[PDB]
Scaffold this active site. Sequence first.
Site, PDB file in Angstrom:
ATOM      1  N   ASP A  49       6.309  10.749  -2.849  1.00 30.98           N
ATOM      2  CA  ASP A  49       6.677  10.125  -1.480  1.00 30.98           C
ATOM      3  C   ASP A  49       7.746  10.648  -0.517  1.00 30.98           C
ATOM      4  OD1 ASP A  49       7.210   7.895   0.296  1.00 30.98           O
ATOM      5  OD2 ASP A  49       7.296   6.368  -1.361  1.00 30.98           O
ATOM      6  N   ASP A 370     -13.884  -0.983  10.948  1.00 28.21           N
ATOM      7  CA  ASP A 370     -13.589  -1.203   9.527  1.00 28.21           C
ATOM      8  C   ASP A 370     -15.029  -1.323   8.921  1.00 28.21           C
ATOM      9  OD1 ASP A 370     -12.250  -2.074   7.132  1.00 28.21           O
ATOM     10  OD2 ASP A 370     -11.807  -4.038   7.924  1.00 28.21           O
TER      11      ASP A 370
HETATM   12  N1  ANP Z   1      -3.433 -17.689  10.440  1.00 24.35           N
HETATM   13  C1  ANP Z   1      -4.199 -17.656   9.258  1.00 24.35           C
HETATM   14  N2  ANP Z   1      -4.209 -18.688   8.265  1.00 24.35           N
HETATM   15  C2  ANP Z   1      -4.993 -18.598   7.187  1.00 24.35           C
HETATM   16  N3  ANP Z   1      -5.659 -17.532   6.706  1.00 24.35           N
HETATM   17  C3  ANP Z   1      -5.454 -16.408   7.583  1.00 24.35           C
HETATM   18  C4  ANP Z   1      -4.774 -16.250   8.552  1.00 24.35           C
HETATM   19  N4  ANP Z   1      -5.146 -15.203   9.340  1.00 24.35           N
HETATM   20  C5  ANP Z   1      -5.753 -14.408   8.136  1.00 24.35           C
HETATM   21  N5  ANP Z   1      -6.340 -15.446   7.333  1.00 24.35           N
HETATM   22  C6  ANP Z   1      -6.925 -14.791   6.026  1.00 24.35           C
HETATM   23  O1  ANP Z   1      -6.612 -13.455   5.685  1.00 24.35           O
HETATM   24  C7  ANP Z   1      -7.719 -12.906   5.869  1.00 24.35           C
HETATM   25  C8  ANP Z   1      -7.649 -11.728   6.804  1.00 24.35           C
HETATM   26  O2  ANP Z   1      -8.424 -10.613   6.434  1.00 24.35           O
HETATM   27  P1  ANP Z   1      -9.014  -9.524   7.689  1.00 24.35           P
HETATM   28  O3  ANP Z   1      -8.992 -10.230   8.933  1.00 24.35           O
HETATM   29  O4  ANP Z   1     -10.272  -8.733   7.264  1.00 24.35           O
HETATM   30  O5  ANP Z   1      -7.681  -8.402   7.682  1.00 24.35           O
HETATM   31  P2  ANP Z   1      -6.974  -7.941   6.436  1.00 24.35           P
HETATM   32  O6  ANP Z   1      -6.015  -8.617   5.874  1.00 24.35           O
HETATM   33  O7  ANP Z   1      -6.016  -6.440   6.993  1.00 24.35           O
HETATM   34  N6  ANP Z   1      -8.087  -7.473   5.124  1.00 24.35           N
HETATM   35  P3  ANP Z   1      -9.051  -5.683   5.371  1.00 24.35           P
HETATM   36  O8  ANP Z   1      -9.326  -5.450   6.639  1.00 24.35           O
HETATM   37  O9  ANP Z   1     -10.100  -5.719   4.400  1.00 24.35           O
HETATM   38  O10 ANP Z   1      -7.723  -4.766   4.804  1.00 24.35           O
HETATM   39  C9  ANP Z   1      -8.967 -13.562   6.205  1.00 24.35           C
HETATM   40  O11 ANP Z   1      -9.905 -13.355   5.215  1.00 24.35           O
HETATM   41  C10 ANP Z   1      -8.348 -15.033   6.518  1.00 24.35           C
HETATM   42  O12 ANP Z   1      -9.180 -15.724   5.556  1.00 24.35           O
HETATM   43 MG    MG Z   2      -9.458  -5.954   9.939  1.00 28.00          MG
HETATM   44 MG    MG Z   3       4.420   4.159  -4.181  1.00 28.91          MG
END
Ligand code: ANP
Ligand code: MG
Ligand code: MG
Length: 637
Positions: A49, A370
Amino acid sequence: GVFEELAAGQQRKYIMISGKGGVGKTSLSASLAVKLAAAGHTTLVVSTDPAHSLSDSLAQDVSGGRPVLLQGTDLPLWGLEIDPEEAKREFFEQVSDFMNRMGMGFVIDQLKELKLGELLNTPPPGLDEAVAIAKVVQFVQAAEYARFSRIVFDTAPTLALPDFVDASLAKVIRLRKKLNGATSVVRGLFGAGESQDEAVEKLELLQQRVRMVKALFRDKTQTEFIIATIPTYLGVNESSRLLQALRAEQIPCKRIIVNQIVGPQQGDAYLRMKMKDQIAALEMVANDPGLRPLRKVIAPMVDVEVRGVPALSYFGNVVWKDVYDQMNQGADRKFFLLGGKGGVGKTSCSSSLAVHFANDGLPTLVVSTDPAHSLSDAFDQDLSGGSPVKITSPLGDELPLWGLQLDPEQAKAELRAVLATLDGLGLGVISDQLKDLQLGELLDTPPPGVDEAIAIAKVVQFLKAPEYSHFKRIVFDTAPTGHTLRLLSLPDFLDASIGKLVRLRQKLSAATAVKRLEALQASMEDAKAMFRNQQTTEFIIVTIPTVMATAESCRLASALQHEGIPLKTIIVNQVVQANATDKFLTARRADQARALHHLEEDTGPDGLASLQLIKAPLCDLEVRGVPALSYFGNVVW
Ligand SMILES: Nc1ncnc2c1ncn2[C@@H]1O[C@H](COP(=O)(O)OP(=O)(O)NP(=O)(O)O)[C@@H](O)[C@H]1O
Ligand SMILES: [Mg+2]
Ligand SMILES: [Mg+2]
Ligand SMILES: Nc1ncnc2c1ncn2[C@@H]1O[C@H](COP(=O)(O)OP(=O)(O)NP(=O)(O)O)[C@@H](O)[C@H]1O
């Protein structure tokens, strides 16, 4: 039980806690080391780290490059904090001119100014990592400090690297061998002597060390692995994939731990926990230096996950609508780049921005760099390949939206492959073309976040007859990583390119192509031309209420602000709401035994899946104390 096998024998054991991204792997490995030293093992715990994770998670400062014993205890335990950027820096680092008379002065001066010695002396990337695991075996084999009964490695999150460095070492090592007996002038193009004997003696050794690690990880007696992950679906999903790789390169892995699991009894506490955070963070997002000028949008969590076309349209109603979509006036073309660390939902957002754009009369493109099949899971259409996909899962209506998935990796090797006379001349004394192309990229891979900065610049060029005519506004969903680059590398990576297109331009003349490097120059400079553009383009940070990613975002935004990039917008995305707190606990606990199940059944018992399961309860500690850690330790192991 479980911990009994980790106190098991006199035989030295190297326990690897590994996983990704904030499971608690550090406090997990720390806690282990402690309960292990308690058990009587003289034990060393290790992290790579820069930020000194092990240091304040022990509350005693171990940040010295060599193993540090801890004062304040009668326990036999040692911390180790290793410097990657000084691992390489320390280990890695007659006149008859009758040639000029024949007119060679021009050609020798052009090759000398091609500065091949640099390309030969530049250490292969990733080195220190592979050497790091080895530095560890060194202090412990040496037995200078104490006789080490167990080692606990907290890895950098998520085996190819010991190889690629071996390879890029061998390439360089074989080419210093072709250089000991060599012509006066040949040795001169590299700055090399007549005797390479001591160099190649030393580089060989380093490579043996890099080898020793790939040897140790597979080593069946000393090494053992433990996967660490949180209850989320994707964590179990991902962890499976990493066990695939673990049974693959065949390093023994017997235990998956799950941390930050909510105890049904004491769960009501966790709710208040998360709450104090949300407030702390949100407060910060309010007053933070440099956060002030940019648009703020607080979106709440949502009833359930957004997998669909209509759902995105309504999410869009929540985020960009209930707050300002007045970002839409401007020139006819608009670029929006959303980016955020992983976990904050920035696809569901980016998608929705594109969807709210679609019905609004305007043709729009969402670009997914992505690899996860994110945007494929987002509109639920499985948009695959590299070409645009028209966007439908509505009832019939106008659908002015396309989206495309550009693997940043396929985008790199597409560029590497495209770059695959003077060929013969270099081969002139001996054959070098293979070794110097491959090492030509040994200077090329060193950039950190650029796999995608390829894809982006690709589409930046795509303004043209088939497309620019067609599209009005477009939006970039970056991958869950470091595409957000806050110091000045933009004119300087461009100078890497122009430096070497000008050196290569120099020596193309003296052989009596590189226009491609000129195509890249225009693409990069046109990618740059919009990024720093005031009117057309703007950037967005998607983040969450946990105060960690908050103050992080502040930094990265404060730096991006003075970097000059028009970042006009922040989004704090999943805000739990109090009136709904009852439902939200039962919600995130519901996810738990779902994903926990989705683990309990994965690809049978045999290949991967379920191995031996370790549950670690969430709350509530600072968890930065030594005895705190012994507590955490006795709770889990
Ligand atoms: N405002 C919100 N309310 C409820 N659920 C949400 C909301 N925003 C995001 N989510 C949930 O969180 C997930 C977000 O995933 P994503 O849009 O791929 O970004 P991430 O969290 O960085 N995942 P990844 O890209 O694979 O590392 C989605 O599957 C949604 O179901
Ligand atoms: Mg994403
Ligand atoms: Mg660590
Ligand atoms: N199971 C847990 N119980 C209580 N606090 C926890 C738990 N897991 C993590 N934490 C806290 O989370 C913070 C940082 O988590 P940490 O344990 O350092 O994760 P990590 O292993 O370092 N992963 P990374 O973010 O990739 O470095 C600390 O302040 C810990 O106190």
